Amino acid sequence: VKKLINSQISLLIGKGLHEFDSLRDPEVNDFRTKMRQFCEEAAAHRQQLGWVEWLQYSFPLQLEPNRALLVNVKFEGSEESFTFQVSTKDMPLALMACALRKKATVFRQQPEEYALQVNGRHEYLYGNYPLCHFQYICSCLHSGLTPHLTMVHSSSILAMRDEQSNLWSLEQPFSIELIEGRKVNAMKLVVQAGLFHGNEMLCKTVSSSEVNVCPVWKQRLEFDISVCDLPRMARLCFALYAVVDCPIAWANLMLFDYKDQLKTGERCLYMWPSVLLNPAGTVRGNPNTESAAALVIYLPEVAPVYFPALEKILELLREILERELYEHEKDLVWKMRHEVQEHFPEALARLLLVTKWNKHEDVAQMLYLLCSWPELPVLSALELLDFSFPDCYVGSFAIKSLRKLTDDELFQYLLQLVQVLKYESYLDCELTKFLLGRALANRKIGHFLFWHLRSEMHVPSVALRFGLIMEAYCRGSTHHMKVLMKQGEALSKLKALNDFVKVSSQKTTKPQTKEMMHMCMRQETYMEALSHLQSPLDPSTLLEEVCVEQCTFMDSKMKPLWIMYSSEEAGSAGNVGIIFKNGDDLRQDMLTLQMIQLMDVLWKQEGLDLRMTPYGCLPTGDRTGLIEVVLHSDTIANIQLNKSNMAATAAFNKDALLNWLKSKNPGEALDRAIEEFTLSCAGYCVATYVLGIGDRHSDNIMIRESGQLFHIDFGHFLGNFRVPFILTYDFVHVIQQGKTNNSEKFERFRGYCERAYTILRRHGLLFLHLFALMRAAGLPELSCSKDIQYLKDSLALGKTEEEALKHFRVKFNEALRESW
């Protein structure tokens, strides 16, 4: 029975569970036993949750960050629907009451026993919120479409739930013995070593003797640090390089084990290929024992030595600087450490960075303060997750403060909280426990954590950790694992179909490839596999029947697939599409869209909706991911082609954009589209300036028929070809209602840019903490300090709001002066 569940996890996580046993590692084995138990306890509490608490799990409320409307409501066991005239200020309960009252008159004879499902979607409408607070209601309000909802009784929700049940004495200096190696390079081999506590050295780097390219050393490597002065999270970093300078390989390893004991004696280090000394890199060796270079080293015995328990640890001009600092300034903060705890709690990061981690006496005093430190705000806790703060006690304190994250906030920073797992030193961590816990408490987080892990199973350095986490997750939800398997089955078929599409395009005409895509899709295995699955881009979006005749592929290099769906129940909300792309890395594209989505959220909170189109984009595997189709939209380029026998017949190229709008928004409807275009253009002007998105042209900027402008292809960001502000006459013409001179409309638009820019600037540090946590991903255009600096400069965070708004107008006018 459980053998199949074991076999299913294996196929789903892309790694056989036998591989975890083969290693014969007590860290892997104890992670698996503990996590499985923690995950089963989380699945248990979930099986005894009240029917509303289950809705908050399976279907978490999609709520937005007066005027009456028509709402079509039906029940389960019938096709009979009723169309009401409810208000946007109405709670769902009142609508639930009307549905029950109108059911009573039809059937000739309580709303607290119901939930309003969104037709053909895993989304529901419940809670003490007026209808206009629900994202589905607002999407129906702007598009003028009618909300189709189903009355789902408590027992029918409980049916779902039931059918888804599962020490100070060692004063000697720290030393090692560098024995021999087994590598490849064409010169002499020097092995530089070093001791690290995060980004910083605990003592000066000590090198090896230049031994011939042919390698044996047997050398003694002593460090400028005491054995009792090694912090718990001490990292020993190595670097193999050839010289007559050229790097070869790198390896790191913790001086303490997962059981807190100091490591002894012989250790073989399967090194990772190099591009100086890399302290950020993984403390687990290269899994390719066949082609990897090795480093045998000795950890000399000093006897069993365990790091002291917290009980033994606990037993042992100021304001003007608190807004990169000199040694006298550092000494001040450490002297004033108690006054920091008491009156400046948010300064903890600056106090943690000044403490001497190379002295056990210092660390303990700091830890005594930390154990009595008040909870920091979410923003302050997000800063503490960086590699800059490696201490376990610090790491735990950050999670302790992060527990007040709303499931909404957690979903906005999950990509960063997953990347941060790469910085980890051991498999068993409070971050994993947290991520897993929240994943098992909320299925949307459960879904997205999985895909963020699964999309990296091909990267050897993180394959064990991630594979292990996904396995632990799968223990806490047998049902969801089965649902995630259907997603993997669709994606498996999609890659095979794409592979054919790629070959056929190199051999025949497009209508010929398109018809055989269809033939291949119409097969039993493809028809079943690609149908009735929760979208990997949004688990609430149900990709029901695959609309094969409406499926094509794109002419761009990697021949992306256009997969259109339809649902009877959902009707028009069921008419959804997904773009499968295979060959490019969708990580930056996703991060950029997420950063845009956040900007929209920060703006929407301050009552400003700049009509942004933050379409889904999710990497699912090796250079494989999905893109959300923005239906009823086309590229500026295609609209500018100006085809004959159309309604968009333009005399001048400038008119093409506005003529297009005029045909898609007839009569009075056009006035709306121009405000849509102005608001979205303003938003994307700021977004792309702040983020530094370059290589913009008509082929990667799109328009919705609604008027809404948006951007695609974010392969380049942070000015990586200092990019200027962007302004095109084709857009200014549209903003100015199609008139040569209309400054009333243009100066209102100049306001939209300024306001959006100032709101973002107020959360500059949020973008700074999120990007600094992202560095863990290994994104080539987000690899160092120079990259974070682009954001610091585009957001002018080292200047006041007045000095920044003037400096912005300067960039805005120079973008307007370049506009023809």
Ligand SMILES: CN(C)S(=O)(=O)n1cc(-c2nc(-c3nc(C4(c5ccccc5)CC4)n(C)n3)cnc2N)cn1
């Ligand atoms: C740069 N890329 C190719 S991409 O990076 O793959 N990418 C596409 C998107 C994307 N596109 C569209 C869209 N595109 C087309 C068009 C079309 C469709 C089908 C066959 C041939 C042409 C180009 C007319 N329409 C009509 N819609 C919608 N929502 C998206 N989210 C985002 N990123």
